[PDB]
Design a protein around this ligand. Structure first.
Ligand code: NDP
Ligand code: SF4
Ligand code: SF4
Ligand code: SF4
Ligand code: SF4
Ligand code: FES
Lengths: 115, 121, 101, 100, 688, 164
């Protein structure tokens, strides 16, 4: 359970559908979500924040997600010099997922036999 | 008796009428009411994607619009979003009758589009 | 302009998490008087921009003085360069000069 | 006649009563026997009859500049509340005037 | 009575119930809450969901408790093995074709199907076949359909037939392919069309403006009142921080039962646009932001430099009683008397409360067997009140109307359209008078469009003569009712917010004010606000009244304050703050108390309780919240008292008795700023 | 016979509330706030004692005053104070210490229990009685058999029959 990340389908569409289950289960209340409907009618988020200085790195959000959108990736080396660099918004989490997608998929090909 | 009401003579303020959030074709009729919340109103942002994406970066909506609809034989299709059902979305059963390449049916989880040439047409 | 500076954007009762509406640039903020002025502005919920010439170790005490995002630190200030002065005041409605010798 | 005088001394008259209480009987009799004649003399004078369950019978005169006086009339007869309205009329002459 | 309460046994406990009650009502009187999907209290019984199945002794089959009547000495069991097996089986049948849609569904978190599956169902499924897939339907801009989630309870069909009256939904097809909707592409045109979203127990019908924005567990709910009309429907406001997310009705059988019109439900998005959040003073550049001290000083300077006869104060449709009594006391303390109301008939006499309120009350009107409407359109003035009128129609109350003919979703007899027809009815030329004379409890409802007329006194005299001849008001029954369409009018009539005789004379000879105070007024006439006058606007939306003002003082909306409002039956109700004040706005009575201090004559009250006590000192019924007095009836003495107003401004027997509401979806500044109301109008314009 | 939730630990909770000596504990007005040790300006705020109505979205009655003796349903609520947005992230900020304490933690069986708590703590209170549900149905559609009655269009006239 490392740095949180947001994932896509192979087409390039976001997996997240703003169900707010990960926000409800979070014991630290480290997630803040706002949503409305997109211009094509889809149900998508407009804000998805994770306070990494409030997070406890439990993985409960990863368990609660029904579409495998939020994960905790294999990155542990993400120390910064300012605390404002650790208040992640939606764009940075998507950038993390776009960085770590192949490793996350390799990990999930094994861990889907157990979960 | 009971005269008809003329709705076309009802005045609407021009500031309100030009600011209605509407939709492109997608999963609705084009031009129906689009639900919005208050986020971005102070910064004057009326668009869904601009509320969290900054720059000329390729949006997720522009990614899914480049994938063509998929021809499926039958009347109902099951959508998982993956080859492996454990790795995708909960299964969505999408109606395919009355659908064509021009007016396909869209998955509410994945945004993939499907149509069938099997409903006697 | 008159008293719209202190009233128009004032949000919250006036603590560390509140908003006063002041964006200020303090020149010579790491000095003796400038540090106290920067503490006085930031504790009421004002954004304070602090350019400095010295090493970061001598300016680190200004980082504590305000909430997240409200203390802005700009190292390598050269006051013979107008670009640094232009960048440091580009969002401020208050400028305070404590530079002396 | 006191009824014609009841537009110059005061700006408004407010009557408070209970609908069923024994103490508001004389006030109700006064209103029933005198509202039409007090309104016929001046058709534009506001006479606010207001009722609530279990309240105290009271008369209130509003003068100019927002001034107000009150007299408690609970347990009074029709002649008695007539009298109390008449001293409410009398104090209206010694009030400062407005409008001009 | 021949034992009008019969005794049954629920789980060996004796229960007394009224006669004609079902098994489900007997279970409810025993403190057991039977699961249900198709039963509703306000609809007719259907009996098709099979979830309410209980066991009755000497019956080998489970009975449907919603439909089965309760007999004497009946023994009901609700916790035997066959009841639990029945509940699990019916739930399993309900879930085999349902889509796996809970993450994307808006009912998730407040779903009857989810919670009943968790409690009365199993934890597994054994179904691996393909499901039924259904295309979605278009029903307009307010109702969103995902029809794969339909469970065929037919609550929507019964609602549209019985309460809304439009009867436009049906079930097409047969068997597994049964399908709810309209066969052709149609728009749901009822004013009460948002209530069916509440009535649907699943996410088949959801609210389109609300869609995908919030979950129900995040919302802080506040019980408030509705101010979009004069009925004052009881509502619940759901907010997330500073933002109101939705508005829902709440139960009040004396006011609104369980309904709310689409304007009162969907106008909340106008609270996010054109909001006044700062004080402004007009300078040479124009209106610009100023401090509260500067704005109060400018308003006080203009209010004091003018003569007392050149000051006018106009109350808006949404001003609470505390701000209205504050403005009234402040203007009267300066020697002014020119008070006006944006809702019209400002010179109407307010001496007896029975002459401008509904004496029968809203729930007491159901005991009337014949109803005569005079010059009103209740479908556009109060659609919830019109729904209760349709409910009265469905169980035998006959309706007649004197006025312009309108669609009311029930059959009525058109007696006439003008005051000449009213006089002919009073004389005896129309046979509807004999129908009124033989009725046990006749009722007359007078709308606000009659009181806005210049000859309203003669019309009210004719109505009083008709009520005297037809026995409308007698011993034990008072059937005379006057309704309103604005939230603030009855409180202003209660406190005495009316112009003095000198001010009425000065308006008659054409005097023009120089200082105008606009207490939330944006629909003022041009005769009342002259050009070149000094305008002080106190309000919450930037509109017609704020674009013209010199001093703008930002106040609170009805979702941000707790003010008193009185509906047209005389009931004192109150709002509650669901969100805090926006920006640098203030409480509305507090602005006037501060302004009275800056002028130089302080108001004698410094708290919310003290201004409410001042209101109770003017009229004592203000202190009794959520209740209505029985108003005094003075027979024909009141009409005899105002005969001078009948002789002057004589009757106009040719002008039709009409309703003044020409735009139902946009009636005030909040609904004019709502994009949802504009889409509602555009949907009715693009259908032609 | 007596069976009012007679199969759970709530039997052992109703008694232990009526133990002698402890069932008659009482304090003077505002005295419990003096010994509470919280700042005294907290008791200048207003409280509301009310039982919240059923949500319109659902049909169940468990969180209502129908099950008042089984479940505590009366609440204490306070008026809102100022909120604003965080400049860096946009999160909702507040300075209210009583922002969620009445809605999360304080529940009472009756109205008088909540009044007693408010009186001993010093909070000034207003009490709102909930609106009572009506169970009697309309005259039309009173029973299931009234759906198919003769009240739809009257008794059928037998004048279109053959031989009239
Ligand atoms: N009693 C007093 O001290 C009085 C002070 N004042 C004035 O008040 C101000 C504050 O004084 P005080 O804080 O006591 O003095 P300090 O020396 O403590 O403050 C001077 C500040 O100016 C900066 N500075 C000086 N020269 C330069 C330069 N060439 N380029 C960039 N930055 C520079 C210094 O930064 P760095 O750390 O890099 O040198 C330092 O932070 C002074 O300007 C002084 O003239 C007036 C009257 C009395
Ligand atoms: S890992 Fe734990 S703390 Fe981090 S976002 Fe998920 S639930 Fe919250
Ligand atoms: S990340 Fe997953 S659980 Fe969280 S809101 Fe998006 S879809 Fe729901
Ligand atoms: S109606 Fe919606 S929330 Fe309820 S069970 Fe079905 S999909 Fe889930
Ligand atoms: S749409 Fe809703 S109310 Fe209508 S039949 Fe389906 S489940 Fe019932
Ligand atoms: S509730 Fe009785 S069968 Fe549906």
């Amino acid at each position: 359970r490392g740095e949180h990340a947001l994932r896509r389908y192979p087409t390039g569409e976001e997996r997240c559908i703003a169900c707010k289950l990960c926000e409800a289960i979070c014991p630290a209340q480290a997630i803040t979500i706002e949503a409305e409907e997109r211009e094509d009618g889809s149900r998508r988020t407009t804000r998805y924040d994770i306070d990494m200085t409030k997070c406890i790195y439990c993985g409960f959000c990863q368990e609660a997600c029904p579409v495998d959108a939020i994960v905790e990736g294999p990155n542990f080396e993400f120390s910064t010099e300012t605390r404002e660099e650790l208040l992640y918004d939606k764009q940075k989490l998507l950038e993390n997922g776009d960085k770590w997608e192949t490793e996350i998929a390799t990990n999930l090909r094994t861990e889907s036999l157990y979960r | 008796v009971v005269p008809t009401f003329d709705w076309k003579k009802v005045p609407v303020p021009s500031t309100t009428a030009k600011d209605i959030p509407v939709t492109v074709k997608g999963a609705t009729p084009a031009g129906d009411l689009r639900a919005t919340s208050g986020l971005g109103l102070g910064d004057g942002i009326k668009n869904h994607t601009d509320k969290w994406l900054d720059g000329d970066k390729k949006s997720p909506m522009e990614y899914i619009n480049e994938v063509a609809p998929i021809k499926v034989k039958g009347l109902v299709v099951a959508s998982y979003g993956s080859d492996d059902p454990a790795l995708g979305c909960p299964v969505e059963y999408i109606n395919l009758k009355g659908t064509s390449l021009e007016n396909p049916a869209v998955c509410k989880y994945t945004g993939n589009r499907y149509y069938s040439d099997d409903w006697k047409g | 302009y008159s008293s719209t500076l202190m009233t128009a954007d004032k949000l919250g009762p006036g603590g560390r998490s509140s908003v006063s509406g002041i964006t200020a640039t303090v020149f010579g903020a790491n000095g003796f008087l400038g540090s106290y002025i920067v503490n006085e502005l930031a504790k009421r919920g004002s954004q304070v921009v602090c350019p400095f010439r010295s090493t970061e170790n001598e300016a680190m005490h200004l980082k504590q003085m305000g909430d997240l995002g409200q203390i802005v630190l700009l190292p390598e200030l050269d006051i013979r360069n107008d670009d640094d002065i232009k960048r440091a005041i580009s969002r401020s409605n208050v400028i305070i000069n404590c530079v002396g010798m | 006649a006191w009824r014609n005088s009841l537009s110059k001394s005061m700006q408004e008259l407010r009557i408070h009563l209970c609908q069923t209480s024994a103490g508001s009987k004389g006030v109700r009799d006064f209103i029933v026997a005198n509202y039409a004649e007090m309104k016929k003399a001046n058709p534009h004078f506001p006479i606010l009859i207001r009722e609530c369950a279990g309240t105290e019978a009271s008369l209130t005169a509003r003068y100019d500049f927002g001034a107000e006086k009150s007299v408690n009339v609970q347990g009074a007869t029709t002649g008695a509340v007539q009298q109390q309205l008449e001293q409410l009329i009398l104090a209206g002459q010694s009030m400062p005037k407005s409008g001009e | 009575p021949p034992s009008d309460h019969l005794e049954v046994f629920v789980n060996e406990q004796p229960v007394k119930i009224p006669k004609g009650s079902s098994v489900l009502q007997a279970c409810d009187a025993a403190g057991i809450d039977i699961p249900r999907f198709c039963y509703h209290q306000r609809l007719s019984i259907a009996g098709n969901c099979r979830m309410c199945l209980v066991e009755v002794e000497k019956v080998p089959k489970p009975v449907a408790s919603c439909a089965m009547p309760a007999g004497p000495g009946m023994k009901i069991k609700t916790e035997t093995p066959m009841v639990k097996k029945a509940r699990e089986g019916v739930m399993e049948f309900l879930l085999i074709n349902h889509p796996l849609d809970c993450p994307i569904c808006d009912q998730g978190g407040e779903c009857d199907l989810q919670d009943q599956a968790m409690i009365f169902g199993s934890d597994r499924s054994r179904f691996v076949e393909a499901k039924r897939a259904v295309e979605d339907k278009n029903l307009g801009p307010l109702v969103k359909t995902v029809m794969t989630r339909c469970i065929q309870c037919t609550r929507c069909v019964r609602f549209a037939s019985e309460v809304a009256g439009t009867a436009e939904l049906g079930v097409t097809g047969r068997g597994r392919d049964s399908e709810i909707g309209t066969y052709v592409e149609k728009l749901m045109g009822s004013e009460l069309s948002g209530n069916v979203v509440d009535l649907c127990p699943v996410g088949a019908l959801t609210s389109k403006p609300y869609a995908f924005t919030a979950r129900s567990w995040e919302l802080k709910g506040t019980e408030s009142i509705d101010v979009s009309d004069g009925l004052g429907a009881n509502i619940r406001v759901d907010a997330r921080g500073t933002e109101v997310m939705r508005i829902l009705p709440r139960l009040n059988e004396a006011v609104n039962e369980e309904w709310l019109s689409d304007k009162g439900r969907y106008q909340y998005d106008g609270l996010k646009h054109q909001r006044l959040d700062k004080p402004m003073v007009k300078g040479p550049k124009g209106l610009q932001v100023a401090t509260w001290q500067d704005a109060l000083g400018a308003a006080a300077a203009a209010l004091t430099s003018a003569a007392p006869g050149e000051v006018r104060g106009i109350a808006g449709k949404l001003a609470d009683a505390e701000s209205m009594v504050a403005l009234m006391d402040l203007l009267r303390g300066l020697g002014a008397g020119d008070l006006a109301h944006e809702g019209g008939f400002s010179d109407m006499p307010a001496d007896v409360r029975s002459t401008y309120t509904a004496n029968t009350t809203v729930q007491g009107l159901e005991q009337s067997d014949l109803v005569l409407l005079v010059g009103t359109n209740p479908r556009w003035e109060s659609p919830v009140f019109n729904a209760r009128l349709r409910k009265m129609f469905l169980d035998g109350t006959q309706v007649g109307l004197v006025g312009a003919p309108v669609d009311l979703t029930y059959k009525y007899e058109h007696v006439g359209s003008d005051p000449a027809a009213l006089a002919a009815l009073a004389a005896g030329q129309h046979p509807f008078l004999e129908r009124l004379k033989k009725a046990a409890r006749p009722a007359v409802v007078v709308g606000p469009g009659v009181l806005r007329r210049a000859d309203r006194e003669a019309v009210m005299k004719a109505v009083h003569e008709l009520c005297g001849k037809a026995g409308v008001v007698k011993e034990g029954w008072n059937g005379f009712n006057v309704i309103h369409d604005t939230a603030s009018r009855v409180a202003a009539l209660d406190m005495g917010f009316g112009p003095s005789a000198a001010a009425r004379a000065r308006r008659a000879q054409g005097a023009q004010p120089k200082v105008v105070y606009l207490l939330g007024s944006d629909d003022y006439s041009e005769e009342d606000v002259p050009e070149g006058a000094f305008v002080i606007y106190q309000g919450h939306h930037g509109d017609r009244g704020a674009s013209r003002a010199n001093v703008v003082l930002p106040g609170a909306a009805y979702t941000e304050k707790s003010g008193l409002y009185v509906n047209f039956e005389g009931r004192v109700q109150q709002t509650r703050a669901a969100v805090p004040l926006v920006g640098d706005a203030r409480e509305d009575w507090a602005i006037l108390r501060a302004l009275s201090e800056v002028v130089g004559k302080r108001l004698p009250y410094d708290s919310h309780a003290a201004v409410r006590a001042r209101l109770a000192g003017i009229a004592p019924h203000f202190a009794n919240i959520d209740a209505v007095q029985t108003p005094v009836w003075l027979n024909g003495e009141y009409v005899k008292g105002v005969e001078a107003l009948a002789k002057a401004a004589p009757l106009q027997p040719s002008a039709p008795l009409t309703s003044t509401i020409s735009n139902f979806y946009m009636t005030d500044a909040i609904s004019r700023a709502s994009r949802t109301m504009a889409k509602c109008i555009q949907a009715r314009q693009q259908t032609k | 016979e007596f069976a009012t939730a007679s199969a759970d630990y709530s039997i052992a909770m109703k008694k232990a509330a009526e133990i002698t000596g402890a069932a008659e504990s009482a304090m003077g007005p505002k005295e419990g706030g003096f010994t509470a040790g919280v700042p005294l300006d907290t008791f200048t705020r207003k409280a509301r004692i009310y039982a919240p109505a059923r949500t319109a979205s659902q049909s169940g009655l468990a969180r209502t005053v129908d099950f008042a003796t089984t479940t505590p349903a009366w609440k204490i609520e306070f008026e809102p104070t100022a909120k604003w947005q965080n400049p860096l992230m946009g999160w909702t900020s507040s300075a209210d210490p009583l922002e969620n304490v009445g809605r999360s933690a304080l529940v009472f069986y009756t109205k008088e229990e909540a009044m007693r708590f408010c009186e001993k703590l010093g909070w000034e209170y207003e009490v709102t009685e909930p609106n009572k549900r009506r169970t009697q149905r309309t005259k039309r559609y009173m029973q299931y058999g009234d759906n198919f009655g003769t009240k739809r269009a009257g008794v059928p006239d037998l004048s279109t029959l053959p031989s009239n």
